[PDB]
Design a protein around this ligand. Sequence first.
Ligand SMILES: *[C@@H]1O[C@H](CO)[C@@H](O[C@@H]2O[C@H](CO)[C@@H](O[C@@H]3O[C@H](CO)[C@@H](O)[C@H](O)[C@@H]3O)[C@H](O)[C@H]2NC(C)=O)[C@H](O)[C@H]1NC(C)=O
Ligand SMILES: *[C@@H]1O[C@H](CO)[C@@H](O)[C@H](O)[C@H]1NC(C)=O
Lengths: 76, 49, 217
Amino acid sequence: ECQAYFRKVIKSTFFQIVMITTVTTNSFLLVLGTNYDIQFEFFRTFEVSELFFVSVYVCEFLMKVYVDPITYWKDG
Amino acid sequence: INEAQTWDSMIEENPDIPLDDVWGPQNYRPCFSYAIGKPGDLGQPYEIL
Amino acid sequence: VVQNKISACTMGILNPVQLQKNYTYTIEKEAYDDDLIVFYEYKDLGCPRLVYYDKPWKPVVELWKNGIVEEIMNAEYVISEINGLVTYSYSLTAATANCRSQPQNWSTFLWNRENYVSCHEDNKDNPLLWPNVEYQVLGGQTNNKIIFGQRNGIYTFHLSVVDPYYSYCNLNTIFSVYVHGALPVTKFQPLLTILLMVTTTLLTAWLAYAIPKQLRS
Ligand SMILES: *[C@@H]1O[C@H](CO)[C@@H](O[C@@H]2O[C@H](CO)[C@@H](O[C@@H]3O[C@H](CO)[C@@H](O)[C@H](O)[C@@H]3O)[C@H](O)[C@H]2NC(C)=O)[C@H](O)[C@H]1NC(C)=O
Ligand SMILES: *[C@@H]1O[C@H](CO)[C@@H](O)[C@H](O)[C@H]1NC(C)=O
């Protein structure tokens, strides 16, 4: 009952674009991180964003293995 | 090491005096001092030859 | 004179012209007594040295005689901070250093080549009990190097040769070195373990509001 809706959340197109934008913003901030000047000004931005990104990826992993105990390891 | 003297700079100091008396060994200070008068913008023709 | 091969000047960091017009710097209540405001002297200290925060640091010094380079001075010496900046540390400690007695420290007293006593000298009479306190002296037979923190600012340092057997002169100098590196460390109340726990709980509430969303329809 919850599992069905939860897989329906998995397949959410909203969720697709959420993950795509999360990863793209992470890559952009990583690129801007190779300059100490911009690493200094807006450092709090970098910190909050890094913790936000790690939270998103870990929640995705945890809930996507929640929907499925064993077959999760099938996918490469 | 610092802003070396030039005709324009000296003329600014004592304009109405004619050019013959403007520059003299009495008022000549070298740039080499590094502790002399100043550190003006670098890159400019050098007139002392 | 301390070597200054790549001075913060002439790089894309500091500009000697702005340094001349009363360049000034501040302290964020972290050095000693508070909000210290110090205006740099370019006539004496010249263009500072630059040191990336990170890599233990130990300065290079040339002894000059008769107005020419005599040699690289390899004798022991100590080094101190003028303003009272305290965000620096020493690589070696008393236990690991080759000391057979309690070494002296800037805390007890100014320093000089006269009052210095060698820690390598075997003396047990007074130092019966001695902890692994920091080791201050640089050079000589000790491989100590200096470790800076996160201040990212100019440090004005007073170097004094300490080995009395080197020379009768009290050789000493003053110089300025600019550290570049450390960034704001305000992890503060928020911590990483406390942060995935905080965020994922805010993400189960999305599912906790998702269950009624699914069951009410
Ligand atoms: C410089 O050296 C002096 C000692 O000549 C240091 O003060 C002394 O430090 C020792 C070792 O800490 C103290 O002995 C004991 O230390 C333990 C450390 O946990 C402490 O719990 C004991 O109560 C006891 O203090 C000794 O008492 C102390 N003596 C004095 C007069 O301070 C000093 O800290 C060193 N400073 C630096 C910057 O190296
Ligand atoms: C700069 O320092 C000089 C000291 O010779 C002082 O006379 C002058 O008022 C100072 N100016 C500023 C802006 O700090």
